[PDB]
């Protein structure tokens, strides 16, 4: 019953706007109709044709240029196309303002394939909208998830190969029509950590690498971002001297090296 009030409110505002701006636009043929013609040359008849054809173009996925196609004003009937596009953006603005509290108050839930269950439903004109994007964020910006499969009750299933041993947060982006500024964002999930698997894919970045004197060489380093597991050791190869240093220590100092010459350090992550 709320949807037909949204339809009749947008249709009332559309016919009221086409009553108002009938003198405002200069037409390419020089029409200048008066206020009581109801003739096909005027702004008001083509504009109310645009407010007659906006909903049928939306639910049958037609453009407003293709819905407002006439044989008198060709190739483009601009009051008809303008009234159709204004009524469609007013309709998607009223659906976004209708469902904004229900989107921003409902939190998606992760369970474990990895499954997001959101407590919503697909819209009535689901194919007229843009596709919704699930968005991911590293816990320690939001990027779009590439692979998922959801049904109409938003019981999704992530088919994207996520990075192992990485804390993740997920949310839903709901676009409403073709307007890019009219997006709704769901709240984030509780933070889920991927189970550990495989070799690390990130090299550990050194902080400071200098000599102490002619017979010692110092290095300080921090662990990398995607460590792919519980960190156990960092192997330091100096070129050769190769040492094993555990996970608690991030600073090691070499010894018994030659004075005044040029070396190369290789640091790995285990």
């Amino acid at each position: 019953v709320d949807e037909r009030m949204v339809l009749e409110r947008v249709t009332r505002d559309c016919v009221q706007r086409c009553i108002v701006e009938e003198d405002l636009f200069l037409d390419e043929f020089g029409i200048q109709c008066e206020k009581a013609d109801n003739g096909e040359k005027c702004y008001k008849t083509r504009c109310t044709k645009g407010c007659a054809q906006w909903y049928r173009a939306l639910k049958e996925l037609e453009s407003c240029q293709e819905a407002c196609l006439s044989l008198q004003f060709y190739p483009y009937d601009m009051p008809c196309i303008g009234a159709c596009e204004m009524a469609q953006r007013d309709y998607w603005h009223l659906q976004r303002l209708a469902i904004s509290h229900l989107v921003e108050r409902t939190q998606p839930q992760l369970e474990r394939p990895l499954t997001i269950r959101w407590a919503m439903h697909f819209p009535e004109h689901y194919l007229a909208s843009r596709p919704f994007n699930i968005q991911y964020q590293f816990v320690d910006a939001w990027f779009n998830l590439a692979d998922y499969d959801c049904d109409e009750y938003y019981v999704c299933e992530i088919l994207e190969a996520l990075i192992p041993y990485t804390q993740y947060r997920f949310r839903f982006e709901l676009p409403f029509g073709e307007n890019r500024d009219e997006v709704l964002y769901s709240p984030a999930t509780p933070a889920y950590q991927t189970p550990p698997e495989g070799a690390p894919i990130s090299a550990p970045v050194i902080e400071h690498l200098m000599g102490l004197d002619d017979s010692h060489l110092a290095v300080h380093w921090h662990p990398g971002r995607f460590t792919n597991g519980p960190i156990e050791g960092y192997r330091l190869r100096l070129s050769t001297s190769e040492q094993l240093v555990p996970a608690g220590r991030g600073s090691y100092i070499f010894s018994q090296l030659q004075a005044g010459t040029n070396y190369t350090l290789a640091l790995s992550m285990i």
Partner: protein, 431 residues
């Protein structure tokens, strides 16, 4: 608490003379160097002297090329609406008397008093900078406006209406608006030499002309952040705001190639790309508003950084102001009004039933095309013509009063409508 009280060295290596000029004993990392030759290229390196006199090593040379000579003024705008005119360093601040609205965009200037700008909520505002009691034809601000531009030759203000997905062309002297058939556009620039309207959507960047043969699509994709039009060198730059990568391009107006891709989480303001004319450089303001980034077209790898002044601490718009005044409205692109006495309905033999008139001309001799409207009572027939000629196909034979409306137009604007009423001749055969 370790002390590194050092004195730094800054060298100047001119490439034009092969001269190394070095000064000593600067205490801070910041230094304001003065007295350079304009329109010249220099190479700069830095090393640091300690107390003992032992300097550090040279760095890599940075391709540092000067701004050319002139009163080169930058117009800063706040997010609170204050307008500050600086020069190209960020020094020399003059606080302007005008007060804009909250979050203004780029101000498009019509004559030296009246300008048009688009705020952050999509509203379009007019301001008379000199005498604020008069000068704006639209009384209230206009919602859902994407950008705004102005044609000096036609004398028309063009804005993208985001609600209608159309481009609205407006007379600044009367406020008469025209709907143009340009769809889903966000940003506009019109070429005044030929009348072509260049526009960029979220997906594509293309051209609208006076005929459908003149529509050339230059790009198709993230999304296009802004674009500018180079009328003099016949080329076309745009910013694509992708997935964490701000990338700038170039195409001619008739090789599509990549100039610089800027990687990072920081990106540019939409409608903030500007062509700096005396370098051949491209500026864009950043989204945080405390930084303007500049790339030279001669050296693509050097991306200069302009800090924003502290009085306008978040910035939302920056223009290089043109040192010449804007040229006035050309009366050579105005189509003349079709004479109402010359509109005849002189018919030939057989089925040649046609309307001829005297052809409308402009001052400079441009192509004048016509739009004709027919009224056979309730019957309507609209023709888009390129000749002073319109053959009437469906003639209702019964001696009507036909109302004919000829609107001459050029590529820049349109002329006045000539409305006549003509008695139809008797049509004896009907076959």
């Amino acid at each position: 608490d370790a002390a590194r009280s050092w004195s730094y060295e800054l060298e100047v290596l001119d490439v034009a003379s092969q001269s190394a000029f070095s000064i000593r004993n600067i205490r801070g990392p910041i230094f304001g160097l003065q007295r350079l030759q304009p329109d010249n290229l220099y190479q700069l390196r830095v090393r640091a002297i300690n107390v003992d006199g032992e300097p550090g090593e040279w760095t890599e040379p940075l391709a540092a090329r000067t701004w050319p000579l002139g009163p080169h003024r930058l117009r800063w705008a706040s997010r609170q609406g204050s307008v500050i005119h600086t020069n190209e360093l960020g020094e020399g601040l003059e606080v302007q008397q005008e007060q804009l609205e909250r979050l203004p965009g780029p101000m498009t200037m019509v004559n030296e008093s009246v300008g048009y700008y688009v705020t952050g909520d999509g509203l379009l505002h007019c301001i008379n900078l000199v005498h604020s009691q008069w000068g704006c034809p639209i009384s209230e601000p206009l919602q859902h406006v994407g950008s705004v531009t102005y044609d000096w030759r036609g004398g028309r203000v063009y804005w993208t209406d985001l609600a209608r997905n159309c481009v609205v062309r407006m007379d600044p002297w009367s406020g008469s608006r025209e709907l143009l058939p340009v769809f889903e556009a966000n940003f506009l620039a019109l070429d005044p030499r030929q009348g072509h309207l260049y526009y960029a959507t979220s997906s594509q960047l293309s051209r609208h002309g006076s005929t459908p043969d003149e529509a050339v699509t230059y790009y198709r994709v993230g999304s296009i952040a802004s674009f500018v039009l180079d009328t003099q060198q016949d080329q076309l730059f745009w910013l694509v705001k992708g997935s964490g990568a701000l990338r700038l391009y170039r195409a001619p107006l008739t090789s599509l190639q990549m100039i610089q891709q800027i990687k990072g989480v920081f990106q540019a303001v939409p409608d903030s790309l500007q062509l700096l004319r005396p370098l051949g450089a491209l500026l864009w303001l950043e989204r945080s508003g405390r930084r303007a980034r500049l790339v030279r077209l001669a050296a693509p790898l050097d991306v200069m950084e302009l800090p924003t002044p502290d009085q306008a601490s978040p910035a939302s718009a920056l223009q290089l102001l043109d040192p010449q005044p804007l040229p006035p409205r050309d009366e050579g692109v105005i189509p003349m009004t079709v004479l109402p006495d010359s509109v005849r309905l002189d018919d030939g033999h057989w089925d040649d039933f046609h309307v001829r008139w005297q052809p409308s001309t402009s001052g400079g001799n441009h192509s004048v095309s016509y739009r004709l409207l027919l009224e056979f009572g309730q019957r309507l027939q609209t023709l888009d013509l390129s000749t002073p000629f319109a053959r009437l196909t469906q003639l209702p034979q019964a001696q009507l009063q036909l109302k004919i409306s000829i609107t001459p137009r050029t590529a820049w604007r349109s002329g006045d409508t000539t409305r006549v009423q003509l008695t139809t001749p008797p049509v004896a055969p009907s076959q």
